[PDB]
Amino acid sequence: EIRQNEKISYRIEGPFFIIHLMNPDNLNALEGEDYIYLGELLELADRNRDVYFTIIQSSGRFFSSGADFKGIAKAQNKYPSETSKWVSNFVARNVYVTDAFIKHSKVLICCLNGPAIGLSAALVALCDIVYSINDKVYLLYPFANLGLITEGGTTVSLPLKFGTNTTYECLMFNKPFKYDIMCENGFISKNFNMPSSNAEAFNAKVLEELREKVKGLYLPSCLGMKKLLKSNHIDAFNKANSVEVNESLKYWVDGEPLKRFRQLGSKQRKHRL
Amino acid sequence: IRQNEKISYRIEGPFFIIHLMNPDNLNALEGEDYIYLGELLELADRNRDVYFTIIQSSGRFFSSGADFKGIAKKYPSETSKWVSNFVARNVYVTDAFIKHSKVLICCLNGPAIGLSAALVALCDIVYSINDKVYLLYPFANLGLITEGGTTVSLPLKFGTNTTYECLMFNKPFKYDIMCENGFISKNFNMPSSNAEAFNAKVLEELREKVKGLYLPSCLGMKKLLKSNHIDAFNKANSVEVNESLKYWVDGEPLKRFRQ
Amino acid sequence: IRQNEKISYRIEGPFFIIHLMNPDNLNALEGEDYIYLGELLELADRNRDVYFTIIQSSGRFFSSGADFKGIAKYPSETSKWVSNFVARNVYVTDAFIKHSKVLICCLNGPAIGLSAALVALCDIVYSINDKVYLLYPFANLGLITEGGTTVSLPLKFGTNTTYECLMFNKPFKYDIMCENGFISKNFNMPSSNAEAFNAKVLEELREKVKGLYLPSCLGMKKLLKSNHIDAFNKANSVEVNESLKYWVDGEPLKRFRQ
Amino acid sequence: EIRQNEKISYRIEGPFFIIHLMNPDNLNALEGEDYIYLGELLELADRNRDVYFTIIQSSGRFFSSGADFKGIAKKYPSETSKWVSNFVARNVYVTDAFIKHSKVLICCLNGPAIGLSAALVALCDIVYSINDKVYLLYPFANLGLITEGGTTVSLPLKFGTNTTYECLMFNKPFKYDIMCENGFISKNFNMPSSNAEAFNAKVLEELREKVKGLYLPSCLGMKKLLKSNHIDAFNKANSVEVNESLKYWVDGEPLKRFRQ
Amino acid sequence: IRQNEKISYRIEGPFFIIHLMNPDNLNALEGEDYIYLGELLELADRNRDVYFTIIQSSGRFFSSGADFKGIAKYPSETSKWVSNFVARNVYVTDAFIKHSKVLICCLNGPAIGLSAALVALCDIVYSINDKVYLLYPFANLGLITEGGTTVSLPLKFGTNTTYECLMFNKPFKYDIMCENGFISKNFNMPSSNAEAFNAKVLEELREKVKGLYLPSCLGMKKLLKSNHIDAFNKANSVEVNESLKYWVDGEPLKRFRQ
Amino acid sequence: EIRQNEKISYRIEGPFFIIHLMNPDNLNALEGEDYIYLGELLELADRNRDVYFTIIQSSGRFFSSGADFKGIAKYPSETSKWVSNFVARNVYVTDAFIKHSKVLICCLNGPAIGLSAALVALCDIVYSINDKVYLLYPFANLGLITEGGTTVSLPLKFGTNTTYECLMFNKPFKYDIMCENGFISKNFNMPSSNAEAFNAKVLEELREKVKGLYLPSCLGMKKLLKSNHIDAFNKANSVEVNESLKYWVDGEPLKRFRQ
């Protein structure tokens, strides 16, 4: 049905399309091709007439550490310019995965087994329902420390779901959206309060409680209600996606993120041993 | 206007008080009852001495919603039948609540369900009798979708994730969610049996709260504040009433109501 | 779908052809006929072999508007006009607004009232000759804009033209249609025989669509619709409810009894 | 480059442009020319390319008691012309100045804010509190006026619709609990109100600590992106507010209420 | 209302008529004259017997715009130009934007500047002959669009025409106005006699208004105005505050002095 | 500052930034890197503070014949390949044309097709060499949908019904339609073979038309005028690229090109 991925898996159980991030030893850090795979999986779930809920689950102690920056400072494709290179490597993947999350017609449920960073936290903030394992989860958007700007439609999603002043304080000064902030704004639906050392039991418990909750309901009604609710901010989200993917290009081409990435991995010690 | 045996009204100074007085049937309303509510709002809106519109109820519930016993209970098709019996009532009452120019105040003497909870969410100020009130929108259990402008009003006043969790799984907007979102302006903390004492206390507090103010200023401020989400509400009204028609036509709400 | 003595339909390949077959009464439509039009559009919208919806008529008019003889029990006048006027208008206007197949109107003659309002909602319009026009007699009847014309007429004819035509009860003539590109093709045929006009329009439509990717047409239409969908929905919702204070006041009826 | 106001001063420290309302004996009540001078200072800070944060501080027990009423009650062919010159212009100017600011706006509340100054506080990006005794008061219904300063958009957006209706229709203050329930105050310093100078100094030190390691052009780009969410709503509200307040000003209700 | 020596008004049945009566100074208006125009529109909008507001003029020009001779006390240049330019402009533009009666303009000749903006901001426009035009010399004066023209010019003439005319200081000539339906009727009278033109317009308006229900006209205008009201009163405050930097810079003053 | 391209050049003359498409033998067909280079040139013009007008000219008998298909006809899937090939270049060049702060002027020396026609419809002022220029958007014939922002730009500048008739049936926007809609500011009525003389005459007249004007005034006026439809253009670009992606993936465009 689709190519296999050693980092992301999926299955179909009745009306549920379960996606599982299964790379816990790298904190579920995703490359661009993994975000494209996520987009393709959401399309597959969206074109299935038996699916009603799309559940994104993860593994380990984090949900996802964000984009995989492994090896970005190495000097060693062959694009004609920096603009073309960064266009192909950033703009397309970001716009594609953000649009795939924006237009999903099934109910998107996120199971937080830990913290989320970067574009992964941006996709977490694009889900309809969020469940957390315990009160030690947070969302971090480190754009000001890396020399970049908002990604994944957070321009609309973060002030909509957390408030304008809170969004400004967290983004201008590079602070995390903690669990208290998420609870003062109704971001998390249920906190399961489970030990952080087992995400498999948390995922199984979430699936069981979801199966309990859907008994006797008319599911086409749920899809129609979501179709009506999505029309509140769809235009804002599309406009924000288009503007963000092209505004980040000037920061990528200016060279500041590469300078900061290089000086991050420049911490050799004077006296060895 | 005409007399209705379930809803009454009166005018006291700048207040236009509407009272649902059918507490033994949990204040369940029919389509003509919603049309009568709309007519009463038009009356209140045309009076130049009226500045506030108070909607009060009686009994243990505020209302139990649309009376389905009058739905099950002439037309060339089912589409025409439901265009006449469902679409028109909803467009009329929802627009009458959306475009009201006087300050709408709801006094929750108990739970509200269905379209009545939708009209509660369209009011400007909501007072509750105690901490046991709630709002229920069982659209997913009845085989229907959002109605009464809840598409815009519920995410606006309770949040997006809360609205999704409550609507997709048929869960009530409880009092704790109301306070976490600032829905109730004042909790009177009175016994749920005596609703008329609650209504009288609300009226006396409103009477003593308007002394020394300039009421045309209140109307101008409301006319300015209404312009924020008026287009969203109008579009939602139209699209809501026209999308819920296929659910009635297919027969799922009627099949589910029969048990 | 039930059977109607005044409207019929057929399916020929990608085309879903609706035909108004009441020429002796100028194709005047009652409320149930507008609800039947809405049902026919919903029927054409839900089958995957249909790509174009073509609305044709007969006689010398396209339609003379709403049949008022039918409009001439309930606990109130408001209930009466909410169930008799508001419901059918909001339903048929939404049915025309949200249609996903390409709407084509073949003007065999003048259109009046809500039928001209529906003509203004089609995507492509052909005329039989240069004698057609659209008339919205809202000012002479005691009513206001209907059928999404609030958004449709200023968008397709201009603001000043719309004000001049609507405030003084003047028709949108054919030269005004040409100044604005309202009519895609003028077939220039005698106004007597509308049947040959419909047959020629169908032959040209059959010749034009071969070699094209029809799902591409549907996708382009889906994208183009998002330009003014919100405006049309707001306009429908506010029109159908503001036009109610005029009915309950009694001016349209009192003007029709004369 | 700019003149000197005896009630408002300014200075530039690195990336910070600090504005100081320095008339605590009269509760920092501002006249029309003072609001125009505030707008001019915001334009000056917006044109300086080394400034990234605009810090607006104040003195005494209040942040500002609003427009100077004793200066309002004052050459013109009619009353319409008089109130177009004296009210509409200054309000539209200062509101557009706060709406379109490119640098990060940070308000330091040393006390209650009332009227148009509260409306300007509601237009700031980040607000700090000296203690838990601060509030905002919009007494438009008690003065015979309507919403001004952009509050039509900013109050329901930051405090909710039902709370805004309850507070505006009945002349009640947005208290500190309402602020905490909506996340309006970013930090509460919990210092005694008898010293706003120490509060301002500590805010400046914390802001100096919190900027190390940040790419500031990225902060400006992120604010530029976030501003475009409600910019059209604010622009639409400005005109309608300043032009609908005129029918209230020319009827004489505000003056006869202040003169009694 | 206070009496003005350059603008008068009268009421005839359902018509509120405003006459600019300074033909020897080419009908140049000052800031107090624009505030007086706003007051007159408020007076017309406040009484229940008026349904149409008609703006007329005299001489060879409809109006030459703002009196630059007049504008050629305050602690700053900004505080001067906020009280002189911004307030009058925002007031008169909001007055013309929110008017609920049917605005009709009788163009007896060219209109320049803010007068041309008010002309383009009306609902119906008549012209005395084919020698009328609108000039917006913002680029030649060191200024930008005013009077809500950012919305009204591309809406009523198109984006490309508006760009070509505003970037290079060219007039919106009569053929351009007749390509977009800006003028509803051309009376084709001699430019020497504007009084006969005004009288002919008035008698034709009296003839056209017979047999209609005028509340229907008012309701239809109320509905049609919601199409672009937000864009209009959103661009007003942005225009008046963006022009302030150009006024404070001193370019329009340095340019007018030669 | 910028690389060298053998199909596009540029220069600066006073306040004019002149871009020249100099590949007449291949009908000025552009590849994806050519569109990225065009966007880079627009950014270069937008950063220069001495430039006020951006002039885009071409050569030969066409203005451009659209995207080069020989280049269209390593990646884990077809979705990834088509994302990286098509979506990025389209969103980038469309955003580059939508947000430009200088006055964009296009000199039509002949027909324009496809994405080049979309960019021509995205410019502020268009001049024509003669009455034989046209615009063609063959999306329905290639199995594609609207691109380059045409969803907003075509109905805005040519009308809704005309746009539907021209897009649904793959018909060109001829010079007649452009004249009835005021799309072309001036027709120069020069011979088709005189494209260089056409460019020179356009430059001379633009140079004579700017004398005396205040240029910051023109830039501020454009900044105000551009906010009429900016959000619509951004939304359209964002939805267009992602919707056309699946038409690309299904394989109909490649199939239709190979025959």
Residue numbers in the entry:
A (entry chain A): 4 to 79, 84 to 280
B (entry chain B): 5 to 77, 85 to 270
C (entry chain D), E (entry chain F): 5 to 76, 85 to 270
D (entry chain C): 4 to 77, 85 to 270
F (entry chain E): 4 to 76, 85 to 270
Sentences reproduced from the published study:
A prominent example is peroxisomal matrix proteins, most of which depend on the targeting factor Pex5 to localize and function correctly. One such example is the yeast Eci1 (Δ3, Δ2-enoyl-CoA isomerase 1), an enzyme that is essential for the β-oxidation of unsaturated fatty acids in peroxisomes. Although Eci1 contains a PTS1, its targeting to peroxisomes can occur independently of this signal. Using cryo-electron microscopy (cryo-EM), we resolved the structure of the Pex5–Eci1 complex, revealing a novel binding interface in addition to the PTS1-binding interface.
